[PDB]
Protein backbone atom coordinates (compact mmCIF):
# COMPACT_ATOMS: atom_id res chain seq x y z
CA UNK A 1 0.00 0.00 0.00
CA UNK A 2 1.04 3.64 -0.26
CA UNK A 3 3.01 4.67 2.82
CA UNK A 4 3.96 8.12 4.09
CA UNK A 5 0.68 8.99 5.82
CA UNK A 6 1.38 7.39 9.20
CA UNK A 7 0.30 10.67 10.85
CA UNK A 8 -3.44 10.79 11.59
CA UNK A 9 -3.81 14.06 13.53
CA UNK A 10 -5.77 14.16 16.78
CA UNK A 11 -5.39 16.94 19.35
CA UNK A 12 -6.56 14.71 22.22
CA UNK A 13 -3.96 12.06 21.41
CA UNK A 14 -1.22 14.63 20.86
CA UNK A 15 -1.66 16.49 24.14
CA UNK A 16 -1.96 13.20 26.02
CA UNK A 17 1.19 11.67 24.53
CA UNK A 18 3.60 14.63 24.51
CA UNK A 19 1.92 17.34 26.59
CA UNK A 20 3.05 19.36 29.57
CA UNK A 21 1.09 17.28 32.08
CA UNK A 22 2.35 14.01 30.60
CA UNK A 23 6.00 15.08 30.65
CA UNK A 24 5.85 16.06 34.33
CA UNK A 25 4.22 12.76 35.35
CA UNK A 26 7.51 10.83 35.56
CA UNK A 27 11.02 11.98 36.57
CA UNK A 28 12.44 10.97 33.18
CA UNK A 29 9.91 13.22 31.47
CA UNK A 30 10.86 16.10 33.76
CA UNK A 31 14.44 15.66 32.59
CA UNK A 32 13.23 15.88 28.98
CA UNK A 33 12.01 19.38 29.83
CA UNK A 34 15.22 20.21 31.70
CA UNK A 35 17.33 19.36 28.65
CA UNK A 36 15.15 21.47 26.36
CA UNK A 37 15.21 24.44 28.76
CA UNK A 38 19.00 24.20 28.95
CA UNK A 39 19.29 23.99 25.17
CA UNK A 40 17.02 27.03 24.92
CA UNK A 41 14.11 25.50 23.02
CA UNK A 42 11.20 27.83 22.35
CA UNK A 43 8.84 24.83 22.62
CA UNK A 44 9.35 22.69 25.73
CA UNK A 45 6.39 20.45 24.91
CA UNK A 46 3.40 20.17 22.61
CA UNK B 1 -47.78 23.72 -43.49
CA UNK B 2 -44.33 23.89 -41.88
CA UNK B 3 -43.79 22.17 -38.52
CA UNK B 4 -41.32 24.58 -36.96
CA UNK B 5 -39.78 23.19 -33.75
CA UNK B 6 -40.90 24.82 -30.49
CA UNK B 7 -38.71 27.75 -29.42
CA UNK B 8 -37.66 26.47 -26.00
CA UNK B 9 -34.27 26.22 -24.33
CA UNK B 10 -32.32 22.98 -24.32
CA UNK B 11 -32.74 20.59 -21.41
CA UNK B 12 -29.10 19.57 -20.96
CA UNK B 13 -27.17 22.80 -21.56
CA UNK B 14 -25.19 24.60 -18.87
CA UNK B 15 -27.14 27.86 -18.77
CA UNK B 16 -29.79 29.60 -16.68
CA UNK B 17 -32.53 29.03 -19.26
CA UNK B 18 -31.68 25.33 -19.49
CA UNK B 19 -31.63 24.97 -15.70
CA UNK B 20 -35.05 26.59 -15.30
CA UNK B 21 -36.26 24.01 -17.83
CA UNK B 22 -34.89 21.12 -15.77
CA UNK B 23 -36.67 22.64 -12.77
CA UNK B 24 -40.07 22.33 -14.46
CA UNK B 25 -39.19 18.69 -15.20
CA UNK B 26 -39.20 17.61 -11.55
CA UNK B 27 -41.90 20.14 -10.64
CA UNK B 28 -44.07 18.32 -13.19
CA UNK B 29 -43.48 15.02 -11.38
CA UNK B 30 -45.29 16.57 -8.40
CA UNK B 31 -48.22 17.84 -10.47
CA UNK B 32 -48.59 14.28 -11.78
CA UNK B 33 -48.29 12.50 -8.43
CA UNK B 34 -51.69 11.04 -7.40
CA UNK B 35 -51.22 10.87 -3.63
CA UNK B 36 -50.35 13.76 -1.35
CA UNK B 37 -47.62 11.71 0.35
CA UNK B 38 -45.74 11.44 -2.94
CA UNK B 39 -46.16 15.18 -3.51
CA UNK B 40 -44.78 16.06 -0.08
CA UNK B 41 -42.05 13.42 -0.35
CA UNK B 42 -40.86 14.88 -3.66
CA UNK B 43 -41.01 18.45 -2.35
CA UNK B 44 -38.97 17.68 0.80
CA UNK B 45 -36.70 14.71 0.03
CA UNK B 46 -33.61 16.80 -0.81
CA UNK B 47 -32.02 18.39 2.25
CA UNK B 48 -30.26 21.75 2.01
CA UNK B 49 -29.18 24.33 4.56
CA UNK B 50 -32.17 26.30 5.85
CA UNK B 51 -32.89 29.00 8.40
CA UNK B 52 -34.53 27.58 11.52
CA UNK B 53 -37.47 29.75 12.59
CA UNK B 54 -38.44 29.77 16.27
CA UNK B 55 -42.03 30.91 16.99
CA UNK B 56 -40.97 31.66 20.58
CA UNK B 57 -37.84 33.76 20.09
CA UNK B 58 -35.95 36.39 22.07
CA UNK B 59 -34.72 38.34 19.03
CA UNK B 60 -35.84 41.96 18.80
CA UNK B 61 -38.68 42.86 16.42
CA UNK B 62 -38.90 39.25 15.25
CA UNK B 63 -42.58 39.84 14.44
CA UNK B 64 -41.71 42.08 11.49
CA UNK B 65 -39.13 39.61 10.18
CA UNK B 66 -41.66 36.78 10.35
CA UNK B 67 -44.13 38.84 8.32
CA UNK B 68 -41.50 39.24 5.60
CA UNK B 69 -40.54 35.56 5.64
CA UNK B 70 -44.25 34.74 5.41
CA UNK B 71 -45.91 37.55 3.41
CA UNK B 72 -48.40 38.24 6.20
CA UNK B 73 -50.09 41.56 6.93
CA UNK B 74 -50.88 42.05 10.62
CA UNK B 75 -54.13 43.87 11.41
CA UNK B 76 -54.75 44.98 14.98
CA UNK B 77 -58.11 43.93 16.35
CA UNK B 78 -60.32 40.99 15.48
CA UNK B 79 -61.56 39.88 12.06
CA UNK B 80 -64.63 41.67 10.70
CA UNK B 81 -67.98 39.97 11.21
CA UNK B 82 -75.92 32.09 22.74
CA UNK B 83 -75.76 32.57 26.51
CA UNK B 84 -74.56 29.36 28.14
CA UNK B 85 -74.31 30.07 31.88
CA UNK B 86 -71.13 32.13 31.86
CA UNK B 87 -71.14 31.86 35.65
CA UNK B 88 -70.94 28.07 35.34
CA UNK B 89 -67.86 28.52 33.14
CA UNK B 90 -66.48 31.10 35.57
CA UNK B 91 -66.81 28.66 38.47
CA UNK B 92 -65.23 25.83 36.48
CA UNK B 93 -62.29 27.94 35.27
CA UNK B 94 -61.82 29.38 38.76
CA UNK B 95 -61.74 25.83 40.13
CA UNK B 96 -58.99 24.87 37.68
CA UNK B 97 -56.76 27.73 38.83
CA UNK B 98 -57.25 26.82 42.49
CA UNK B 99 -56.95 23.07 41.95
CA UNK B 100 -53.40 23.12 40.59
CA UNK B 101 -52.08 26.08 42.57
CA UNK B 102 -53.43 24.98 45.96
CA UNK B 103 -55.26 21.68 46.38
CA UNK B 104 -53.26 19.30 44.17
CA UNK B 105 -50.46 17.55 46.08
CA UNK B 106 -47.58 16.38 43.89
CA UNK B 107 -43.90 15.63 44.31
CA UNK B 108 -42.30 19.04 43.80
CA UNK B 109 -39.65 19.16 41.04
CA UNK B 110 -35.91 18.98 41.63
CA UNK B 111 -35.17 22.49 40.31
CA UNK B 112 -36.50 25.68 41.87
CA UNK B 113 -36.06 27.34 38.47
CA UNK B 114 -38.91 25.29 36.94
CA UNK B 115 -41.61 25.42 39.64
CA UNK B 116 -43.45 28.36 38.06
CA UNK B 117 -43.65 27.35 34.40
CA UNK B 118 -44.90 23.96 35.60
CA UNK B 119 -47.71 25.70 37.49
CA UNK B 120 -48.67 27.64 34.36
CA UNK B 121 -48.64 24.46 32.27
CA UNK B 122 -51.02 22.58 34.57
CA UNK B 123 -53.59 25.38 34.84
CA UNK B 124 -53.56 26.13 31.11
CA UNK B 125 -53.85 22.39 30.48
CA UNK B 126 -56.82 22.03 32.82
CA UNK B 127 -58.50 25.21 31.56
CA UNK B 128 -58.33 24.04 27.95
CA UNK B 129 -59.65 20.56 28.77
CA UNK B 130 -62.57 21.84 30.86
CA UNK B 131 -63.59 24.52 28.37
CA UNK B 132 -63.60 21.76 25.73
CA UNK B 133 -66.08 19.66 27.74
CA UNK B 134 -68.45 22.34 29.05
CA UNK B 135 -68.77 23.96 25.61
CA UNK B 136 -69.13 20.60 23.84
CA UNK B 137 -72.93 20.30 24.28
CA UNK B 138 -73.41 23.70 22.62
CA UNK B 139 -70.82 23.01 19.90
CA UNK B 140 -71.01 19.29 19.00
CA UNK B 141 -67.88 19.51 16.84
CA UNK B 142 -65.69 19.64 19.95
CA UNK B 143 -67.12 16.27 21.01
CA UNK B 144 -65.56 14.46 18.04
CA UNK B 145 -62.49 16.70 17.80
CA UNK B 146 -58.94 15.70 18.74
CA UNK B 147 -57.12 17.53 21.54
CA UNK B 148 -53.33 17.36 21.22
CA UNK B 149 -50.93 18.00 24.11
CA UNK B 150 -47.45 19.17 23.09
CA UNK B 151 -47.54 17.65 19.60
CA UNK B 152 -45.28 18.93 16.85
CA UNK B 153 -46.34 21.16 13.95
CA UNK B 154 -43.87 21.54 11.08
CA UNK B 155 -43.77 23.70 7.95
CA UNK B 156 -40.99 23.99 5.36
CA UNK B 157 -41.06 26.56 2.55
CA UNK B 158 -38.91 28.58 0.14
CA UNK B 159 -39.04 32.37 -0.08
CA UNK B 160 -36.48 34.65 -1.71
CA UNK B 161 -33.00 34.17 -3.11
CA UNK B 162 -29.41 35.32 -2.62
CA UNK B 163 -26.00 34.90 -4.24
CA UNK B 164 -23.73 32.47 -2.41
CA UNK B 165 -20.86 34.74 -1.27
CA UNK B 166 -17.85 32.45 -0.81
CA UNK B 167 -16.27 29.13 -1.69
CA UNK B 168 -16.48 27.05 -4.82
CA UNK B 169 -20.17 28.01 -5.09
CA UNK B 170 -19.59 31.78 -5.01
CA UNK B 171 -21.97 33.58 -7.34
CA UNK B 172 -24.46 30.72 -7.62
CA UNK B 173 -28.11 31.56 -6.99
CA UNK B 174 -29.69 29.63 -4.12
CA UNK B 175 -33.10 29.87 -2.50
CA UNK B 176 -33.61 31.05 1.07
CA UNK B 177 -35.05 28.08 2.95
CA UNK B 178 -37.02 28.37 6.18
CA UNK B 179 -38.44 25.74 8.49
CA UNK B 180 -40.69 26.18 11.52
CA UNK B 181 -40.72 23.48 14.18
CA UNK B 182 -43.37 24.13 16.81
CA UNK B 183 -44.76 22.30 19.84
CA UNK B 184 -47.95 24.15 20.81
CA UNK B 185 -49.00 23.54 24.40
CA UNK B 186 -52.47 22.49 23.24
CA UNK B 187 -54.35 22.41 19.96
CA UNK B 188 -57.74 21.28 18.67
CA UNK B 189 -58.04 19.51 15.32
CA UNK B 190 -61.34 18.95 13.49
CA UNK B 191 -62.21 17.01 10.35
CA UNK B 192 -64.18 19.88 8.77
CA UNK B 193 -62.68 23.21 7.74
CA UNK B 194 -63.71 26.39 9.52
CA UNK B 195 -65.40 29.23 7.62
CA UNK B 196 -63.34 32.04 6.16
CA UNK B 197 -62.68 35.36 7.86
CA UNK B 198 -62.57 37.34 4.58
CA UNK B 199 -62.83 36.43 0.87
CA UNK B 200 -59.79 35.20 -1.00
CA UNK B 201 -58.16 38.02 -3.02
CA UNK B 202 -59.03 40.42 -0.19
CA UNK B 203 -57.02 43.62 -0.66
CA UNK B 204 -55.91 46.08 2.01
CA UNK B 205 -53.71 49.19 1.78
CA UNK B 206 -51.19 47.96 4.36
CA UNK B 207 -47.79 46.84 3.06
CA UNK B 208 -45.74 43.88 4.27
CA UNK B 209 -42.44 45.04 5.83
CA UNK B 210 -39.33 44.93 3.65
CA UNK B 211 -36.09 43.87 5.35
CA UNK B 212 -32.85 45.41 4.11
CA UNK B 213 -30.53 42.89 5.78
CA UNK B 214 -30.26 39.11 5.74
CA UNK B 215 -32.14 36.92 8.23
CA UNK B 216 -28.75 36.38 9.90
CA UNK B 217 -28.49 39.94 11.23
CA UNK B 218 -31.52 39.22 13.32
CA UNK B 219 -30.05 36.34 15.34
CA UNK B 220 -31.18 33.49 13.12
CA UNK B 221 -29.02 30.49 12.35
CA UNK B 222 -28.93 27.91 9.58
CA UNK B 223 -28.81 24.13 9.80
CA UNK B 224 -29.39 21.21 7.45
CA UNK B 225 -31.67 18.44 8.72
CA UNK B 226 -34.82 16.62 7.69
CA UNK B 227 -37.47 18.77 6.02
CA UNK B 228 -40.90 17.97 7.45
CA UNK B 229 -44.45 19.20 6.86
CA UNK B 230 -46.72 18.18 9.73
CA UNK B 231 -50.09 19.36 11.04
CA UNK B 232 -50.00 17.43 14.32
CA UNK B 233 -50.84 14.09 12.74
CA UNK B 234 -49.89 12.12 9.66
CA UNK B 235 -51.75 12.48 6.37
CA UNK B 236 -53.73 9.28 6.99
CA UNK B 237 -55.45 10.82 10.03
CA UNK B 238 -59.06 11.89 9.33
CA UNK B 239 -58.74 14.96 11.59
CA UNK B 240 -56.80 16.96 9.02
CA UNK B 241 -57.96 20.50 9.90
CA UNK B 242 -57.23 22.93 12.71
CA UNK B 243 -59.52 24.77 15.12
CA UNK B 244 -57.43 26.43 17.85
CA UNK B 245 -53.94 26.40 19.33
CA UNK B 246 -53.01 27.35 22.89
CA UNK B 247 -49.44 28.56 23.45
CA UNK B 248 -47.58 29.06 26.72
CA UNK B 249 -44.77 31.61 26.55
CA UNK B 250 -41.57 30.54 28.36
CA UNK B 251 -40.49 32.27 31.54
CA UNK B 252 -37.47 33.65 29.69
CA UNK B 253 -39.81 35.87 27.63
CA UNK B 254 -42.27 36.94 30.34
CA UNK B 255 -43.17 40.53 31.10
CA UNK B 256 -40.91 41.19 34.09
CA UNK B 257 -37.68 40.01 32.45
CA UNK B 258 -38.26 42.00 29.26
CA UNK B 259 -38.92 45.21 31.18
CA UNK B 260 -35.73 44.65 33.17
CA UNK B 261 -33.73 44.28 29.94
CA UNK B 262 -35.17 47.67 28.83
CA UNK B 263 -37.07 46.05 25.92
CA UNK B 264 -40.45 47.05 27.31
CA UNK B 265 -41.82 47.76 23.82
CA UNK B 266 -41.20 44.09 22.95
CA UNK B 267 -43.73 42.72 25.46
CA UNK B 268 -46.49 42.63 22.85
CA UNK B 269 -44.07 41.91 19.99
CA UNK B 270 -43.31 38.53 21.57
CA UNK B 271 -46.99 37.60 21.36
CA UNK B 272 -47.34 38.68 17.73
CA UNK B 273 -44.27 36.81 16.49
CA UNK B 274 -45.35 33.52 18.06
CA UNK B 275 -48.81 33.69 16.47
CA UNK B 276 -47.58 34.52 12.96
CA UNK B 277 -45.00 31.74 12.99
CA UNK B 278 -47.16 29.21 14.83
CA UNK B 279 -50.28 29.79 12.73
CA UNK B 280 -48.50 30.20 9.39
CA UNK B 281 -46.88 26.79 9.83
CA UNK B 282 -50.11 25.14 10.94
CA UNK B 283 -52.36 26.71 8.29
CA UNK B 284 -49.69 26.08 5.65
CA UNK B 285 -49.21 22.44 6.65
CA UNK B 286 -52.96 21.83 6.36
CA UNK B 287 -52.94 23.22 2.82
CA UNK B 288 -50.23 20.80 1.70
CA UNK B 289 -52.27 17.97 3.22
CA UNK B 290 -54.89 18.96 0.62
CA UNK B 291 -52.40 18.92 -2.26
CA UNK B 292 -51.76 22.68 -2.54
CA UNK B 293 -48.17 23.88 -2.92
CA UNK B 294 -46.33 26.86 -4.39
CA UNK B 295 -47.06 25.87 -8.01
CA UNK B 296 -50.70 24.96 -7.23
CA UNK B 297 -51.73 27.78 -4.93
CA UNK B 298 -54.65 27.32 -2.57
CA UNK B 299 -58.16 27.80 -3.95
CA UNK B 300 -59.72 28.01 -0.46
CA UNK B 301 -58.37 30.31 2.26
CA UNK B 302 -57.14 28.21 5.17
CA UNK B 303 -58.12 29.50 8.60
CA UNK B 304 -56.96 28.85 12.14
CA UNK B 305 -56.86 30.77 15.40
CA UNK B 306 -54.66 30.65 18.49
CA UNK B 307 -54.57 32.12 21.98
CA UNK B 308 -51.17 33.04 23.44
CA UNK B 309 -50.74 33.31 27.20
CA UNK B 310 -47.74 34.02 29.41
CA UNK B 311 -49.56 32.20 32.23
CA UNK B 312 -51.56 35.20 33.48
CA UNK B 313 -52.16 37.50 30.50
CA UNK B 314 -53.98 36.23 27.42
CA UNK B 315 -53.90 37.33 23.78
CA UNK B 316 -55.97 36.03 20.88
CA UNK B 317 -55.01 35.70 17.21
CA UNK B 318 -56.68 34.70 13.94
CA UNK B 319 -54.82 33.69 10.78
CA UNK B 320 -55.96 33.24 7.18
CA UNK B 321 -53.64 31.63 4.62
CA UNK B 322 -54.14 33.00 1.11
CA UNK B 323 -50.75 32.28 -0.52
CA UNK B 324 -48.41 29.34 -0.79
CA UNK B 325 -46.70 30.99 -3.78
CA UNK B 326 -43.90 32.65 -1.83
CA UNK B 327 -40.87 31.74 -3.97
CA UNK B 328 -39.27 34.23 -6.35
CA UNK B 329 -40.62 32.32 -9.35
CA UNK B 330 -44.11 31.71 -7.95
CA UNK B 331 -44.40 35.15 -6.31
CA UNK B 332 -43.64 37.03 -9.53
CA UNK B 333 -47.26 38.07 -10.20
CA UNK B 334 -49.05 37.36 -6.91
CA UNK B 335 -51.53 39.95 -5.57
CA UNK B 336 -52.60 37.66 -2.72
CA UNK B 337 -51.26 37.97 0.81
CA UNK B 338 -51.78 36.22 4.14
CA UNK B 339 -53.60 37.89 7.02
CA UNK B 340 -53.27 37.69 10.80
CA UNK B 341 -55.49 39.46 13.34
CA UNK B 342 -54.38 40.05 16.92
CA UNK B 343 -55.35 41.87 20.09
CA UNK B 344 -53.47 43.24 23.07
CA UNK B 345 -52.90 40.91 26.00
CA UNK B 346 -55.40 41.09 28.87
CA UNK B 347 -55.30 39.43 32.30
CA UNK B 348 -57.52 36.44 32.99
CA UNK B 349 -56.98 36.66 36.76
CA UNK B 350 -54.71 38.48 39.21
CA UNK B 351 -53.81 36.24 42.17
CA UNK B 352 -54.92 33.38 44.39
CA UNK B 353 -55.32 34.25 48.07
CA UNK B 354 -56.67 31.73 50.58
CA UNK B 355 -58.76 29.46 48.29
CA UNK B 356 -60.27 32.16 46.05
CA UNK B 357 -59.09 33.60 42.74
CA UNK B 358 -58.89 37.41 42.83
CA UNK B 359 -59.36 39.82 39.95
CA UNK B 360 -60.91 37.30 37.56
CA UNK B 361 -61.94 39.09 34.36
CA UNK B 362 -64.99 37.91 32.43
CA UNK B 363 -64.08 39.76 29.23
CA UNK B 364 -61.09 37.55 28.48
CA UNK B 365 -63.07 34.39 29.25
CA UNK B 366 -65.70 35.33 26.66
CA UNK B 367 -62.97 35.64 24.03
CA UNK B 368 -61.77 32.13 24.85
CA UNK B 369 -65.40 31.00 24.76
CA UNK B 370 -66.04 32.62 21.38
CA UNK B 371 -62.94 31.01 19.86
CA UNK B 372 -63.94 27.58 21.15
CA UNK B 373 -67.50 28.19 19.88
CA UNK B 374 -66.63 28.72 16.20
CA UNK B 375 -67.81 25.86 14.00
CA UNK B 376 -67.60 24.85 10.33
CA UNK B 377 -70.47 25.92 8.10
Amino acid sequence: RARGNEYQPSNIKRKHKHGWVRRLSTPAGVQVILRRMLKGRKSLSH
Amino acid sequence: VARYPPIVASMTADSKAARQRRVQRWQATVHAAPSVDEKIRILTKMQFKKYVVHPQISALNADRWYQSFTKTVFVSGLPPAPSLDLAALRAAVCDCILQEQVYVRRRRPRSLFDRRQALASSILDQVVRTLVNLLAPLNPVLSTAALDCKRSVDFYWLRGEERIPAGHRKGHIDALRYQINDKPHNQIRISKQLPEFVPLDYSIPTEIPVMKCKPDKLPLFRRQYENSIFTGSKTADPCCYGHTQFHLIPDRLKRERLIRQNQAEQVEAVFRANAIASLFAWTGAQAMYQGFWSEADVTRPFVSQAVITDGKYFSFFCYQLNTLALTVQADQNNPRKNLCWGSQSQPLYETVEDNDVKGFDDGTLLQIVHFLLNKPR
Binding site: - | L60, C213, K217
Partner: protein, 48 residues
Protein backbone atom coordinates in the same frame (compact mmCIF):
# COMPACT_ATOMS: atom_id res chain seq x y z
CA UNK C 1 -11.43 45.92 34.75
CA UNK C 2 -8.66 43.75 33.30
CA UNK C 3 -5.29 42.63 34.67
CA UNK C 4 -6.68 42.98 38.20
CA UNK C 5 -7.87 40.54 40.84
CA UNK C 6 -11.56 40.19 41.60
CA UNK C 7 -12.31 39.37 45.27
CA UNK C 8 -13.61 35.84 45.63
CA UNK C 9 -17.34 35.90 46.35
CA UNK C 10 -19.13 33.58 48.77
CA UNK C 11 -22.73 33.40 49.91
CA UNK C 12 -23.78 36.73 51.39
CA UNK C 13 -20.80 38.70 50.11
CA UNK C 14 -20.85 42.36 49.10
CA UNK C 15 -21.44 43.72 45.63
CA UNK C 16 -18.42 43.88 43.32
CA UNK C 17 -17.74 47.51 42.40
CA UNK C 18 -15.07 48.82 40.02
CA UNK C 19 -14.56 52.53 40.68
CA UNK C 20 -11.98 53.13 37.93
CA UNK C 21 -12.34 51.03 34.79
CA UNK C 22 -9.46 49.69 32.71
CA UNK C 23 -11.70 48.80 29.76
CA UNK C 24 -11.40 51.02 26.68
CA UNK C 25 -13.65 50.44 23.67
CA UNK C 26 -13.90 51.80 20.14
CA UNK C 27 -16.95 52.15 17.90
CA UNK C 28 -16.32 50.78 14.41
CA UNK C 29 -18.10 51.03 11.07
CA UNK C 30 -19.77 47.68 10.24
CA UNK C 31 -18.10 45.51 7.63
CA UNK C 32 -21.34 43.87 6.52
CA UNK C 33 -24.80 45.46 6.44
CA UNK C 34 -26.52 45.74 9.81
CA UNK C 35 -29.96 46.91 10.98
CA UNK C 36 -30.16 50.61 11.72
CA UNK C 37 -30.56 49.93 15.45
CA UNK C 38 -27.46 47.71 15.62
CA UNK C 39 -24.10 49.21 16.60
CA UNK C 40 -20.69 47.50 16.43
CA UNK C 41 -17.92 47.80 19.01
CA UNK C 42 -14.42 46.41 19.41
CA UNK C 43 -13.89 45.57 23.08
CA UNK C 44 -11.13 44.01 25.21
CA UNK C 45 -11.19 40.23 25.17
CA UNK C 46 -11.88 40.13 28.93
CA UNK C 47 -15.06 42.20 28.64
CA UNK C 48 -18.40 40.39 28.81
Amino acid sequence: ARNVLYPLYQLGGPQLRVFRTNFFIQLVRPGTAQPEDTVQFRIPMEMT
